[model samples]
Target: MGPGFDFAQAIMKKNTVIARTEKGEFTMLGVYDRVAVIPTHASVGEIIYINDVETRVLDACALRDLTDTNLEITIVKLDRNQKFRDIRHFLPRCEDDYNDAVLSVHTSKFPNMYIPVGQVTNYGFLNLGGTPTHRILMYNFPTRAGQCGGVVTTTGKVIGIHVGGNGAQGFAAMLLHSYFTD
Candidate 1:
């Protein structure tokens, strides 16, 4: 896949998968006993056709043992409306909490600056707390297949994966960071 949203070379690599982008080259990072696999049953134009599916995680013992090894995962057929709507509305709440923390830390230096709700609603942010929990940022907009299940880049580092937006008004995936050393 080309950067900024394209799904051409998105495949599950059995041995090792290395990707090169304008941002530079990256090897998949993470360790999971099972990398969740999902399927898509419809074409690009179809809607609500992600029925008849399966969820699985890859099983690779050697890869799972590495400390900082990045795991390349495959999530098949990611579309906009595969899930329900209510879950999507919860994203903004998490965004609000994160942004509030940012503002508290930065506003003293740059007093007039503030994070807009629109920016908060669009791009997802990180939760400094290393817990797998849900937070709402804003309502959900229709997202495409390529938009889901990709790496999130911030400050020259890969942070998390773009799981999927909630089907509700404005909910999205809670960014899950790997619990490596903890």
Candidate 2:
């Protein structure tokens, strides 16, 4: 058993989404009923397989929390496939919304999964243009190869979407309500 073993089953059954691209397969966090988010780092080839069913990229937008930290999130449109399931609910976003305890879900190789538990270390900035943005959630966990498009949740509710990370810490973008509350 690994860390966050208790949550592995439930998360795997619902929240975790396998997005297959031309390069390879990666993890995507399922949000809303038929909506999921992934990091732009992974290209969603002409046609992506969401949970093994062909799907398309609905939108790819940059994230900027109330504090103005910039992040990139790719919104995917999950088709009505029987194999697909609804994902965990998201924790509403706010200027002061912060939770130290969180879980990161990822799939390295086929048939292998990892759920690492860690804390929200701090916030980071992506200098996409003038004046850096804020609230790029940082985690105290090392990231894996295909883990960038994973999920970060606290108490079973999603708070952030894994974008990228390093040995010392991982980076996630705050899940803006705007992405889901349509």
Candidate 3:
């Protein structure tokens, strides 16, 4: 169940529609659930935006195979009030300081792709960091609520479980790189 937070019932009560270029549009019904558990191996950091706060992290392993071309990563927060459908849009709303943190980490690692999670479009699901292998990049797609603590590997395997996310957009997950890589 991990850590939990509360938000306006209205925000947590509505279902969201997501448009997939290939699959068309789908609906995500919202629920007042507890905070999701990300992996513990994920590195956590803090970023301040205006008066707001956010968190970010780097998952140890992306998917199943540590050496696999694809990687899966995620970001989460305990507070329900902080949700965004678009990663790009959510970044700007963050304070300048927080925004800088995101760029610093993202540009340096250069994640192959970034996807949002949750009922609303605002949460981040899959993010690729580091270089690609064999032109393939792995990720935890459509990461669901309470699924953060689960392990992810480059080969699309589960290695770790969920933990939690910081304010802005940071998350922490248990490391399972050893199990898959070893």
TM-score for each predicted model, relative to the true structure: 0.27, 0.73, 0.19
Error of 3 at 172 (Å): 22
RMSD of each: 16.9, 3.9, 17.6
Please, what are the lDDT tens digits per residue for candidate 3 over residues 93-167?
221111101000011122121232221121323442333312121222333333332222211122222233333
lDDT of 2 by residue, 1-182 (tens): 43344444456567676777876777777766666777755666556776677775545554455665545666766554533354434455563345444444555464445455466754656542243645577767776566666666655456777666666677777775656776
The C-alpha local distance difference test score for the whole of candidate 1 amounts to 0.25
Candidate 3, position 132, lDDT: 33
The candidate scoring highest on TM-score is 2
Alpha-carbon deviation at 91 in model 2, angstroms: 2.0
* Lowest-sum lDDT 10-residue window in model 3: 97-106
**Per-residue lDDT of 65 in model 1:** 15
Q: After superposition, how far is residue 145 of candidate 1 from its true place, in Å?
A: 2.3
Best-to-worst order by lDDT is 2, 1, 3
By summed lDDT, the worst window of 10 consecutive residues in model 1 runs over 99-108
Question: Candidate 1 regions off by >4 Å?
Answer: 1-142, 166-178
lDDT of 3 at 84: 35
- lDDT, model 1, position 145: 32
Candidate 1 lDDT over residue span 98-142, tens digit each: 221111001112222211112224343423123222332333344
